[PDB]
Design an enzyme around this catalytic site. Sequence first.
Site, PDB file in Angstrom:
ATOM      1  N   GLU A 162       0.320   2.727  10.917  1.00 29.34           N
ATOM      2  CA  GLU A 162      -0.380   2.219  12.075  1.00 29.34           C
ATOM      3  C   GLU A 162       0.484   1.910  13.283  1.00 29.34           C
ATOM      4  OE1 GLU A 162      -1.270   1.502   9.016  1.00 29.34           O
ATOM      5  OE2 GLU A 162      -3.495   1.834   8.976  1.00 29.34           O
ATOM      6  N   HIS A 209      -9.732  -7.654   4.356  1.00 29.54           N
ATOM      7  CA  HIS A 209     -10.369  -6.492   4.890  1.00 29.54           C
ATOM      8  C   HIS A 209     -11.695  -7.017   5.302  1.00 29.54           C
ATOM      9  CE1 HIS A 209      -7.628  -4.981   1.861  1.00 29.54           C
ATOM     10  NE2 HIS A 209      -7.766  -3.743   2.298  1.00 29.54           N
TER      11      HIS A 209
END
Lengths: 329, 329, 342, 342
Positions: free
Chosen positions: A59, A128
Amino acid sequence: LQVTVRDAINQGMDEELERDEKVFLLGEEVAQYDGAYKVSRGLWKKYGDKRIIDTPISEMGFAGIAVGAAMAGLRPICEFMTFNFSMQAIDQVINSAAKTYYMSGGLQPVPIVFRGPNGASAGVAAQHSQCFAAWYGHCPGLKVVSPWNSEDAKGLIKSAIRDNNPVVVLENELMYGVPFEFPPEAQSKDFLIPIGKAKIERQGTHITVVSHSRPVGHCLEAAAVLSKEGVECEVINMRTIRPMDMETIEASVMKTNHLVTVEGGWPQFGVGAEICARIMEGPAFNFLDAPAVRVTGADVPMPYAKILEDNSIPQVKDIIFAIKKTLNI
Amino acid sequence: LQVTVRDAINQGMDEELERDEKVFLLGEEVAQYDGAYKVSRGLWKKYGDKRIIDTPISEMGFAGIAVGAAMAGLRPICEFMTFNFSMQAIDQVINSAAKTYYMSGGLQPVPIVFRGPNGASAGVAAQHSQCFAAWYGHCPGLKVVSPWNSEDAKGLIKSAIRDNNPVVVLENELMYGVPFEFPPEAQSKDFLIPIGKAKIERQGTHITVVSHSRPVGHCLEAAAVLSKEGVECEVINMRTIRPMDMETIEASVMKTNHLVTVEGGWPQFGVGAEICARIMEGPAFNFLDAPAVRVTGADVPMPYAKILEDNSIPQVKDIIFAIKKTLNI
Amino acid sequence: MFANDATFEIKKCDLHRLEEGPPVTTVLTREDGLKYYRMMQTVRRMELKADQLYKQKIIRGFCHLCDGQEACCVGLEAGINPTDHLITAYRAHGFTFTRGLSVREILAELTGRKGGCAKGKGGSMHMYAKNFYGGNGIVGAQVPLGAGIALACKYNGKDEVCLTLYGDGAANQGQIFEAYNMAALWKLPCIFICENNRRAAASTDYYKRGDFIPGLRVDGMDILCVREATRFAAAYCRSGKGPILMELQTYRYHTREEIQEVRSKSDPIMLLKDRMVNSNLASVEELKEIDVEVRKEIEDAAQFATADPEPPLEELGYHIYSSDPPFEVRGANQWIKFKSVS
Amino acid sequence: MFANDATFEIKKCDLHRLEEGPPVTTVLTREDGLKYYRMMQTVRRMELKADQLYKQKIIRGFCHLCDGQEACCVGLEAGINPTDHLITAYRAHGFTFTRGLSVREILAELTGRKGGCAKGKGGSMHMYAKNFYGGNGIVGAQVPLGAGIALACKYNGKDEVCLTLYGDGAANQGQIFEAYNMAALWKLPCIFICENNRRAAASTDYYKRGDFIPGLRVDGMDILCVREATRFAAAYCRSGKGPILMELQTYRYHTREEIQEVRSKSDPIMLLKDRMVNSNLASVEELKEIDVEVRKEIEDAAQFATADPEPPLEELGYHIYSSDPPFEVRGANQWIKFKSVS
Ligand SMILES: [K+]
Ligand SMILES: [K+]
């Protein structure tokens, strides 16, 4: 036609890709795998490796690449599997994309879009399930939208791509497969939703219920339960976290005299905080006949157990309880 | 006796490091260089390699390594040159540190401390100027404190080391060389300032002014200007950002009937927003004779030129203008 | 009478995963190396002017000087085109100039004046030029950025390369390794450049850190091979071979005495001077004149950069978003509004 | 009457930056090989039940299986003491068991029930045990965590080491290299294990990504190489020589036919089973009947795990902070208060 949110978005990306070759898509399993959520389905098969790039799991690095391309004239759509994973690139979004237009004295625009699902999912546990509305919403030089139904997702993803500055699009996983009447004018490919403008989803007169993304559905559910009882709500779907349309919310408040905001994020410093602080500071304040309440996510890292999880995001009763509380009915 | 904010902190770590050999400092330039801002001056010289560890420029890495040590059972003070840099490590802080005790159903605690200067400095331009109080304070499982003066700084840094959970300490670099009167009870190596409690730095009866970090100083300046025209402000130093001491602010608003928040960083979804939202939800809404307002940093990334930057951070002028606007005088 | 051009030896580079590196011999055309002088010299005198402006306090916050390295930034521009891309970190004065910016707008931006290149908004670290993505202050962030710019190149296919630079200090940024990976993986025309100017890194063999990515180690005091290297890397990338690493070895001036032996044994400007001269490519007096000329350009600029008024406060909110209609921006409290125009 | 012990050849490791690696020959005692089988079988059967409970939807969210990889967690736990540390990413059902927890608590956390090892707060990815720093949902986040557990080791000097695992998906995380560098730099007893269960990397020689850190490539279907190369790596780290990479080459079972020819010609339970049989260390009946004990083990646990009541609502707020006084936590709206006790 009834199209699902997932399909709406696909339509948007596809049309925009077709319209403009400066436009490409990078991210994890976007290409061959067809989208981590099947959102980018068939785009690779149609635009090829130049335009739909699968990225390694890096990322901080690939967000930073998209921003580079953007700075150099390209129009990248950058995807994060969930926005929890964006915490690694957050430096790249804030420090390289957001502030750059301003630091260069207007020399260097950064036409980049960041999209992905955000907030609570279902038993994906504490790492998450974070909402980022509030944090991104906070930064100058960024635009931040949070779409609800098909109509929104297709319009907004399309305006974000067209926009010449970094736009952050907070999708939601549970909304993906939910289907919706999709008016003929939305099936067009010039269908655009102006950033910075809320939508009244439901006319009403007794109380204003402002909300964004998924829990907007639970508001409409509440509003329908509650009209069986003579209580009308004006339900509003922000669409846009920043620059949020405060005019629309005030105007509704001036008619209803009450306000409840509803959001899935954590409570403190959230989207509800900035809305009230705004009601108070603005001209809508004097119209209030009772303090504005916030309904949000429970103030914990998100648990796993189904029962605990259910009381961690706002349930349709919790909304009804704050609406009744506010009208002291 | 007079000690600068810089020294107060340096004492704190010195007393902590002696008292417990589990405790250790690490970050960039903390050791041989005496500190990026001379905050750890002489610590390496006294405690050695083992206890005071110079790191390479690898934030996501060493924040990681710190959190690790804390989980294995050490008590690391992990320094960030400045908190703008922590955005690369923000994920180790939020996801590894802050949610771990909870995910583990109480099995695995994380006694880390993160500290460094935060918010605006002097002519460092956009990427070094950011405030983070609101972003951190947003997350369950974290404690977030923001010292103002010497006495705060030494208390809250000792408190946080002694605390058993991750605690982010937002120092202010322009405060570092400010000297303060150091009551003898502060030089004591038993000094502790409990997290979660505010201090009233000036009793007053006309308005409540709430603020944290450097701008608490400027509220004391505005309050001296004002009581020359007989307006008495109550100045509250927040001290803790999470979990804030909202009781205190409520008590005081019930007395004064008015409220102003002065914070350093950006306005939207910012620290003021939360105090304001709370104030409306709480009991003290009905003692409020005028809407509470917010005095913030201007809503742009931080510019370079002196005059521009001077108008991007709240100045005493603006605190007063606001108070008078509230007191409708 | 004078030499039209001359031939010189340059040090040969160490090689990582390459069989042949750049020539050990080159040809400086008297006429070119007259321009390499005037440039280097310009950067040196500007950096010295800045430093003095900063010691005076007319410059604030950060002020990163690049003197000793003028062979790098001029050497680089000598082996790439105008139309290639360059991004570095915060020591970006040399580059901003060699990339098009006048000394005036560079100086004026430092002293925070309307006549600065970014109208005082940016200051030392954030200067942007044509095909220069400037200086960036988050250590390391410039590297994946530049990999992006390289992606952009390949993607337009106009044979442009991109020089992404970082300092031996940033050499351990995780993102740098993420960017070496995708760089190699998609064969980006990106030249990774480590300005190594000498505890921090367990391997100080920067040119090899890229592992699967080939590298070479250059002598950055010598503008000749810096140029050579850069022609060598640039060409490598154009022909599709993919990414490549360059360690540029150097020594910034900004005790005072290891600094002293380095300067009188190998100043980049001095070395070029003893080569132009001891091979009749130019005259000590010829060079003594361009010294007088630059002194005047710097003097003209420092004059402009301290005489130009601050920026107007009605432009504080300008340039947040590109290409939008004007809107307002909240200042210190809700009654202070600032106009923002694109 | 059965042998007591036998002697086998294990494959030879590839080395990187190493002189001599772990021996190509080892001793398996009878009573040991019996213990490794019951452990492999339990992890296998465990995951099978998980997978079945998970198509049935008693298990929600993530559910990563490690069946196929049993040579890894059992063999690693063969090579280290219980006082050494292990930390992995989210594929952690096998390691939770080898590191101490019972099939009961693991399945009950999977079905999110109060009897679960994290009271149903964690779910599949976050389980902790004695010296097990869990699974972490964030790819590669645990490698710098591991480096830190390693730093603590040195810091108390008890000659304990750290096994820090990651799969080949996470082998391009910027953080990973940031930890290679510090690990070498501070000579930390950290064993960086890369589970390579087989595009994304520009270089698929994983034991070498460490670059300046020595590594070995091991075969992860042979419980014996794993135990070997682990005792080897433990030795290396404890002898104060700092960090090491160890690529465990393996294969997760979860075209579906490549999955097949890899099971007949190398389940890692079948391999150990054939070894024991072919060298008089155990009978085929002995083993067949240990299966029956394992299958009944897992069956009773699974039963407990589907029957067990969910945690009580009123504890939704517990365990936010450690060692604090009780306090309240806000729920879906302000009238919802949840007590939080440490
Ligand atoms: K765009
Ligand atoms: K602590």
